[PDB]
Design a protein around this ligand. Structure first.
Ligand SMILES: Nc1nc2c(ncn2[C@@H]2O[C@H](COP(=O)(O)OP(=O)(O)O)[C@@H](O)[C@H]2O)c(=O)[nH]1
Ligand SMILES: [Mg+2]
Lengths: 190, 50, 50
């Protein structure tokens, strides 16, 4: 009828595929040569259940001087995809440590989807050997499920930008979570 | 007239802002009781409705 | 705006598309809490230049 505008924001460690995830969502064509540090000023059309939603996709990077301007993207945020890398175990443990408190501080009572990207690389021989060099292993799905339960995640999926696996369903569930308008107020003052 | 009807992209009149106010709530919000204001507020309201 | 017409808007837009990122340029919002969300389109409409 009249498309509804919902704000989606991505926060995660660098090199975990956030920008590539949004890009594959946008044009459905993997950029093999050039990837911008951020994907900006885009709105995409999605229909999930009889409702037509324009999703405005913001992107946050922290490489150089973007961290100072990151807080400014959090206001009026409707839904968040907290993202991390499956082929990089270091990404997971920082999510409870540093990413979560900033998200809670600037924008509370917001839905959050914890996602792990690039399922293909966990079975890759090169990444497996590199992790085994430090007596490590790729992030197990069980650990991701436990984390999703642990930090209040609305849902937990996995993406693959190269193979375009699960992006459509991931963003569908993201906008489905966004369309919910929370539950009133809790301990609201007299 | 141009924004609603142009080949590139059309802004439909039924869209609501963050507050939920449609173009008509917005036109009521600026509405005042001076003649200089009502004279065009009512005209634009009828135009958009039709 | 000088007498309703600035000779650099077309050149800026031409350079922007030629440089590859027209989309990100035409609609870039303000970030200060005081003007959040305001677009170049808002300025064009407010200045009353069709
Ligand atoms: N082989 C492969 N590489 C990927 C995939 N997704 C992301 N990458 C790589 O991850 C790198 C950086 O990811 P990026 O989009 O910049 O994540 P960001 O740093 O959070 O913005 C890119 O150079 C890609 O080559 C994938 O599905 N397969
Ligand atoms: Mg990037």
């Amino acid at each position: 009828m009249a498309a509804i505008r919902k704000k989606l924001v991505i926060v995660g460690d660098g090199a975990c595929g956030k920008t590539c995830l949004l890009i594959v969502f946008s044009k459905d064509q993997f950029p093999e040569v050039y990837v911008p540090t951020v994907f900006e000023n885009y709105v995409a059309d999605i229909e999930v259940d009889g409702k037509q939603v324009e999703l405005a996709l913001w992107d946050t990077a922290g490489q150089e001087d973007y961290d100072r301007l990151r807080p400014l993207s959090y206001p009026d945020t409707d839904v968040i995809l907290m993202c991390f890398s499956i082929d990089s175990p270091d990404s997971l443990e920082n999510i409870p440590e540093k990413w979560t408190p900033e998200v809670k501080h600037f924008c509370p009572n917001v839905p959050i989807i914890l996602v792990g990207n690039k399922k293909d690389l966990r079975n890759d021989e090169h990444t497996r050997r590199e992790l085994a060099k430090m007596k490590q292993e790729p992030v197990k799905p069980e650990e991701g499920r436990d984390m999703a339960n642990r930090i209040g995640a609305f849902g937990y999926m996995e993406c693959s930008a190269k193979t375009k696996d699960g992006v459509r369903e991931v963003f569908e569930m993201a906008t489905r979570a966004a369309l919910q308008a929370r539950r009133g107020k809790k301990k609201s003052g007299c | 007239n141009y924004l609603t009807e142009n080949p590139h992209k059309k802004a439909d009149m039924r869209r609501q802002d963050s507050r939920g106010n449609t173009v008509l709530h917005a036109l009521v919000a600026i509405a005042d009781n001076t003649r200089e204001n009502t004279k065009f507020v009512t005209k634009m309201y009828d135009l958009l409705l039709l | 705006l000088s007498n309703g017409r600035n000779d650099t808007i077309p050149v800026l837009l031409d350079i922007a598309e030629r440089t590859g990122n027209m989309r990100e340029f035409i609609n870039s919002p303000f970030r200060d809490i005081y003007y959040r969300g305001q677009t170049a389109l808002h300025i064009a409409i407010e200045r009353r230049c069709k």
